């Protein structure tokens, strides 16, 4: 199985620490007694391949050899030192949290929160598009990809127009992080690298704007954001895979 590597000064303290971790549901891959050496750090490095999070050492009341510490530093293996057990636990939990956040940041572009915008006014047509809108459903967040869905009458074929991402939100000049549904109208700034759609040409003020969800976006949302996402937001998402023709 997979798990962290622990080390204690004595056998008894080791047993106690292991019992503690048992109650904490923290899995242990291997153990050791006495000073930490390069070999033990390597033994954690074995765990590095299977689980990056679990390639860490919980060391209780134990000297760490400079060689071992240096190898750990060279190969990204965390070594945790503590005089008391609970401190070690705390350090580990914080570590796992940090790992979670770092995993979020790579999927930051991917995670998109569902929202439907009805344009109230237009301040800048393009480069960058700025639009006074009110969130009629869902929740508008920063860095949210926006798209307008519309079918040309002659073609009768659905067109998806990606406007770009939201870089700023402001209401009465006051900067906002997000805008919930039903909230009073706000002005949002959407911009993208390269050529960008233009109001009064590609799209009109009447056209309703939707968050640009993608199968990948869904997958990311259900991978890291399950706790956060409202039921209504899931509902909206399922409504949105239809308009975006998602599998
Ligand atoms: Cl996309």
UniProtKB/Swiss-Prot annotation:
It comes from the Eukaryota. It is found in: Cytoplasm. Belongs to the TRAFAC class translation factor GTPase superfamily. Classic translation factor GTPase family. IF-2 subfamily. Plays a role in translation initiation. Translational GTPase that catalyzes the joining of the 40S and 60S subunits to form the 80S initiation complex with the initiator methionine-tRNA in the P-site base paired to the start codon. GTP binding and hydrolysis induces conformational changes in the enzyme that renders it active for productive interactions with the ribosome. The release of the enzyme after formation of the initiation complex is a prerequisite to form elongation-competent ribosomes. This is Eukaryotic translation initiation factor 5B. It comes from Chaetomium thermophilum (strain DSM 1495 / CBS 144.50 / IMI 039719). The lineage of its organism: Eukaryota, Fungi, Dikarya, Ascomycota, Pezizomycotina. The chain holds residues 870 to 1116 of 1116 of the full protein.
